[PDB]
Design a binder for this molecule. Structure first.
Ligand SMILES: [Zn+2]
Length: 456
């Protein structure tokens, strides 16, 4: 009261239940929450007014699938053109080698996370779900502590997804037994993280989720423990889903499809969101919907790894929640969620060359990146510019020379531009970016410090 007023925004995209948009309108903020969205709001109890003229405001973008530690693994010549098998082997080899050489402990990961998460804020991303699977040694080291610390320092909203690779090469697994933890170690560790960090209240800034790498990378016992843990502590469940080699490997290991696996081990529920979902059998999609599972579309790695086009239109037709994410920077290789939406806008269209009404629109993509992702993460308090939701807001300027001649500013955010840099970004009511610059973080100092720590 002590309120913040963003006045005169040229366009507001709400993604509320009526899909309202507004022009020349205001957003009124008090503490962590939005008070009003509308024309000519009162500045009676306002301590600060921000000039929104020439900007478009959206809900803060929500990256429902990251791997922050991979920020250290960008643009590696040997991984430029690689199929999954070679790629995965190259990432595991590097994370294991750097770690054993003392170059990749929680303290390095903290600063790599700080850089990728600051990038995220600067890209208009106000919540990130990071899935960290790398816990070498005889004790679960403090990598998630490190990412939470970075996220907390920056003030970005954060879901830490505790991942693993519990299926050993012995038992038909992919990875070296250095990455393989006993299921009880993983379960024990997750219990402690929930107790220490999880903020279940509305507008909570740190949440914990439980996330096996996959149906063919983790023991079915882990899936069931997590299903129990999620019901008892009311947290959510995350895993990869229907990557191209999965159906065959699942059949080989278990004689069932990946979806049947999930059903059998307690994961066919509305506690679950699923990464990629590139190549499910079409017949199972109605079952996804009936179960209430959510799907995060990840166009950039699906393309980069040569996997192709997830049936997103089919998911939307079926009423399935669709969110959006970047995955990690070893398979993207950036954290630029907004830019990746352009990739999706365009790459999907050749699959349906004569039915353009099937193509994903700009507004559908922006909805996936905000409300959709919010729903993946089970956050009814995010992803929507309306009274009562979190004051998580991302705004871009529309008056650049590269956006001249744009007729619809929302389509324009996808279809035009030299830069995806946000102008104004608010998280939990706190202004963190203004004039395309961090207001509390030392951008240059963060770059210098993290750069020095990247393994060479
Ligand atoms: Zn992933």
């Amino acid at each position: 009261e002590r309120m913040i007023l963003i006045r005169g925004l040229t366009r507001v995209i709400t993604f509320d239940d009526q899909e309202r948009e507004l022009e020349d309108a205001d957003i009124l903020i008090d503490g962590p929450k939005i008070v009003a969205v509308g024309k000519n709001l009162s500045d009676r109890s306002v301590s600060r007014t921000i000039d929104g003229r020439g900007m478009i405001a959206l809900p803060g973008l929500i990256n429902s699938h990251q791997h922050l530690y991979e920020g250290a693994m960008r643009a590696i010549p040997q991984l430029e053109r690689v199929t999954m098998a070679s790629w995965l082997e190259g990432v595991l080899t590097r994370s294991a080698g750097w770690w054993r050489d003392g170059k990749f402990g929680p303290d390095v990961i903290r600063e790599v996370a700080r850089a990728v998460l600051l990038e995220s804020l600067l890209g208009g991303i106000t919540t990130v779900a990071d899935q960290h699977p790398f816990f070498p040694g005889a004790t679960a080291d403090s990598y998630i502590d490190a990412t939470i610390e970075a996220a907390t320092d920056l003030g970005i909203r954060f879901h830490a997804v505790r991942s693993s690779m519990t299926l050993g090469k012995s038992e038909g697994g992919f990875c070296d037994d250095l990455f393989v933890e006993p299921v009880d170690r993983v379960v024990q560790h997750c219990l402690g993280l929930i107790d220490q960090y999880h903020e279940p209240e509305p507008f909570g800034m740190v949440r914990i989720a439980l996330g096996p790498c996959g149906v063919t990378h983790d023991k079915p016992e882990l899936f069931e423990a997590f299903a129990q843990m999620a019901a008892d502590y009311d947290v959510r469940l995350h895993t990869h889903f229907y990557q191209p080699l999965d159906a065959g490997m699942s059949d080989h290991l278990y004689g069932m499809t990946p979806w049947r696996f999930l059903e059998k081990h307690g994961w066919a529920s509305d506690r679950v969101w699923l990464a990629h979902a590139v190549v499910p059998p079409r017949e199972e999609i109605p079952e996804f919907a009936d179960a209430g599972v959510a799907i995060a579309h990840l166009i950039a790695p699906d393309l980069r790894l040569g996997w192709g086009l997830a049936p997103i239109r089919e998911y939307l037709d079926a009423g399935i929640t669709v969110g959006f994410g970047t995955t990690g920077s070893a398979s993207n290789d950036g954290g630029n969620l907004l830019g990746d939406l352009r990739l999706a806008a365009l790459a999907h269209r050749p699959a349906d060359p004569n039915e353009p009404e099937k193509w994903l629109s700009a507004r559908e993509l922006l909805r996936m990146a905000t409300r959709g992702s919010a729903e993946c993460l089970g956050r009814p308090d995010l992803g929507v510019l309306e009274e009562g939701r979190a004051a998580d807001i991302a705004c871009w300027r529309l008056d650049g020379v590269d956006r001249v001649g744009v007729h619809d500013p929302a389509i324009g955010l996808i279809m035009t531009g030299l830069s995806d840099r946000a102008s104004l970004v608010v998280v939990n009511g706190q202004v963190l970016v203004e004039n395309e610059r961090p207001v509390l973080a030392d951008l240059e100092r963060i770059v210098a410090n993290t750069t020095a720590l990247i393994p060479k």
